[PDB]
Design a protein around this nucleic acid. Structure first.
Length: 173
DNA sequence: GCCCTGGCG
DNA sequence: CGCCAGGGC
């Protein structure tokens, strides 16, 4: 059934490998619980600036790049997720935000019941200078797992996004 | 399922 | 800034 041992072990591995971490409570929109067709995750600007430089600009409309999404907390097929800069405010329209879509209908990131779930996305840094090519996801499945992270980094509050290099965010394990 | 879009506080 | 959607494909 798991308490939090497997979570903890995965955390230690992320903590000491070359990852940049994004931690949030999934919103109802992220998971699809709203009824909207976003089929993707809202991400803050700083994630793209550090992880996907090639898409970080306004000299082309809606640039995007692909990456492998692998879910570590759930048995779930991998997918080619798509990191996107919706930037139409520069092209005469209204959008100016970043997104990752294409998790798959069966992902915990597309399950309406994980709304409010404490999630951690571990982006694998490109040590050779380009775009992140891979993200490992963990959606906490219980309050037990939530306590491990929240004990370590403080409470995670909807809207209040946490991101940073693994060695810093998870240094307190 | 996913594209790209606009609106709300 | 994050989140709430949805027409059209």
């Amino acid at each position: 059934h798991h308490g939090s041992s497997v979570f903890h072990n995965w955390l230690l591995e992320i903590a000491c490998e070359n990852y940049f971490v994004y931690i949030k409570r999934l919103s109802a929109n992220d998971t699809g619980a709203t009824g909207g067709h976003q089929v993707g995750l809202y991400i803050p600007s700083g994630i793209v600036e550090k992880l996907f430089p090639s898409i970080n600009h306004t000299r082309e409309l809606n640039p995007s790049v692909f990456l492998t999404a692998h879910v570590s907390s759930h048995d779930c097929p991998d997918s080619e997720a798509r990191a996107i800069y919706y930037n139409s405010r520069h092209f005469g329209k209204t959008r100016n935000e970043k997104r990752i879509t294409r998790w798959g209908r069966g992902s915990p990131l597309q399950d309406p019941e994980n709304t409010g779930a404490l999630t951690l996305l571990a982006f694998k840094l490109d040590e050779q200078g380009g775009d992140c090519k891979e993200v490992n996801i963990w959606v906490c499945a219980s309050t037990d797992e939530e306590d491990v992270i929240e004990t370590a980094i403080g409470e995670v509050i909807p809207g209040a996004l946490i991101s940073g290099p693994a060695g810093q965010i998870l240094g307190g394990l």
